[PDB]
Design a protein around this ligand. Structure first.
Ligand SMILES: Nc1ncnc2c1ncn2[C@@H]1O[C@H](COP(=O)(O)OP(=O)(O)OP(=O)(O)OP(=O)(O)OP(=O)(O)OC[C@H]2O[C@@H](n3cnc4c(N)ncnc43)[C@H](O)[C@@H]2O)[C@@H](O)[C@H]1O
Ligand SMILES: Nc1ncnc2c1ncn2[C@@H]1O[C@H](COP(=O)(O)OP(=O)(O)OP(=O)(O)OP(=O)(O)OP(=O)(O)OC[C@H]2O[C@@H](n3cnc4c(N)ncnc43)[C@H](O)[C@@H]2O)[C@@H](O)[C@H]1O
Ligand SMILES: Nc1ncnc2c1ncn2[C@@H]1O[C@H](COP(=O)(O)OP(=O)(O)OP(=O)(O)OP(=O)(O)OP(=O)(O)OC[C@H]2O[C@@H](n3cnc4c(N)ncnc43)[C@H](O)[C@@H]2O)[C@@H](O)[C@H]1O
Lengths: 195, 195, 183
């Protein structure tokens, strides 16, 4: 079991689904969908899209994270958990994982897909212009770089606390063709889990 | 409840005072000054300047941190705590926050004012030339960048541990007028407190 | 006092440890890796010549208790992380820090070029720059995490500068460290 993370809009789910393809024993589950479910279950009027959950107070937001972690420890087959290491809120960065949730999921490792902010912006803005996932953030190149290095710091903290590996997958290099990052990362991860 | 910090001599304080002015609902309190006073009240022969507070053994230093944190953990609706995230000691960096003081102060988040070392050196040496706070360390640009990055890493670790926010306010950009930095910061902080 | 001493591989960590042990009689230097090797050889009479990770952690704990027992100033040569096919794994686990009760961590931070040179030098007589810098930043973050949980010092010793003569880094680091132990 491994947690798989990246900045929003850089191709985290695409990699997850290609993995689910090339493997039969493993599942893929999006922690974000579960969080959305519980969040709208208790605050259906302020929550309308996924990003809205970031505006929630700390106490309620913690409750939602803890509830959402419940439906993943239900999974027993090898699993990859699509989630975030930190979330950009009006108040700053908020940890995607908190001791309760880490001890519930008990991940064997974390995987960080790190991109060049140019590509991330390109993908976010292409989806936005095409009327899809319109609600991601319009961030600067600098803001996205900051988000990524902060993701890294959070990951290392979690690892220091919980005996999990920290794998950094470098996708900063320029791509010859589309989804080259995706295939490369999928190949690296297949190599990892087969041992 | 937010802790407000920055490297020495970048203006952490000045920002706090203008906040206390520009908002009426909030109260601002200088945790660092209280630590200074406690330390030289209890060890008057070792501590004469503020930097002397950094050579204390960790056990005694911790006891003083906790004593000062009790005098300052208020129950106002909004509270900003002026302090440091890390301290340069002869033995390395020492955390400005510890689990005990976090549990006392109950902070919702940490706020890091990040400056460009050029401005920091400017302000430090300007005060030093005018006989103000002469004990401030004479540091290279690289030393100051290191101090800021280590502050960031501390903030992230505590956040992961205590489910708090980490807000990074970038003030490396050029300022048309002196203190432009300050107002920018103040404004964003108010935007945070009002939500 | 008690300090952990850590840095990227093959860059002169043990040379510094030995010169340290020399220039000071009051100090003790110990290699955590050797201690875990010894413990493993002693608890399982044959499995170990170069294990479940529960047992692995238990022997890490045993070695840490052996090191908890030295009286005087202590410097513990070990690593903040190890590069595995699955990613970086922390050298240290919370219980190890609670056992050793270190006053501080010291990170010897090098320039990847010199690291590569020293490595290949050892190779001829029996990683890229980016890989080495990543490992260094990760070590730094691990150190600050351990400090955040146990309130120990985090010292960064900069040895990225060019050497006037070889082993200058070594005596520089020893000078800084000796200056620390004497306060
Ligand atoms: N742990 C946690 N704690 C608390 N709250 C949490 C939480 N986790 C989540 N939440 C909550 O939920 C929210 C976020 O949840 P979530 O919706 O899961 O995050 P998201 O990344 O913003 O959503 P996307 O699926 O749109 O992005 P993606 O990374 O999957 O990229 P994609 O593959 O689609 O591809 C992107 C686009 O680029 C294209 N593309 C993909 N790969 C490439 C490539 N290699 N080259 C070119 N284009 C590519 C794709 O076709 C597509 O068009 C948070 O704000 C918070 O509210
Ligand atoms: N948590 C903790 N744990 C353990 N020990 C702790 C601790 N916290 C503190 N301690 C100890 O106790 C001390 C804390 O005392 P404390 O008073 O809290 O801080 P300090 O050490 O005095 O640090 P500085 O005053 O240098 O920073 P500042 O930016 O606030 O200064 P100023 O606003 O005046 O402004 C700086 C100068 O630049 C100028 N300036 C500011 N902004 C601008 C601008 N935008 N443009 C131009 N000039 C500017 C100002 O006018 C001024 O001249 C520490 O030294 C430490 O030893
Ligand atoms: N907490 C933990 N958990 C789990 N496992 C743990 C653990 N702690 C430890 N371990 C285990 O310990 C094992 C190994 O780790 P460890 O024993 O801690 O270190 P190492 O990298 O394996 O040792 P090396 O001999 O390769 O190099 P060095 O860094 O000591 O530097 P050197 O002086 O030799 O220098 C090498 C070359 O550089 C040259 N050189 C040195 N300084 C200079 C200089 N200043 N100028 C020029 N050349 C120099 C030298 O002369 C030489 O040629 C692993 O199995 C690990 O698992």
């Amino acid at each position: 079991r491994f947690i798989l993370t990246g900045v929003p809009g850089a191709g985290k789910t695409t990699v997850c689904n290609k993995l689910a393809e090339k493997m039969s024993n493993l599942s893929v589950v999006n922690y974000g969908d579960v969080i959305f479910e519980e969040a709208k279950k208790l605050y259906p009027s302020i929550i309308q899209v996924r990003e809205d959950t970031r505006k929630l107070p700390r106490a309620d937001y913690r409750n939602i994270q803890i509830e959402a972690a419940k439906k993943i420890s239900l999974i027993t087959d090898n699993l990859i958990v699509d989630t975030h290491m930190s979330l950009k809120t009006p108040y700053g960065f908020y940890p995607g994982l908190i001791p309760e949730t880490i001890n519930i999921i008990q991940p064997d490792g974390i995987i960080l897909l790190e991109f060049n902010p140019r590509d991330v912006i390109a993908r976010r803005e292409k989806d936005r212009l095409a009327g899809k996932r319109v609600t991601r953030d319009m961030e600067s190149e600098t803001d996205i770089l900051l988000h990524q290095q902060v993701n890294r710091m959070f990951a290392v903290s979690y690892s220091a606390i919980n005996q999990c590996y920290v794998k950094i997958i470098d996708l900063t290099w320029p791509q010859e063709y589309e989804f080259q990052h995706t295939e490369y990362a999928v190949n690296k991860i297949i190599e990892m889990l087969n041992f």
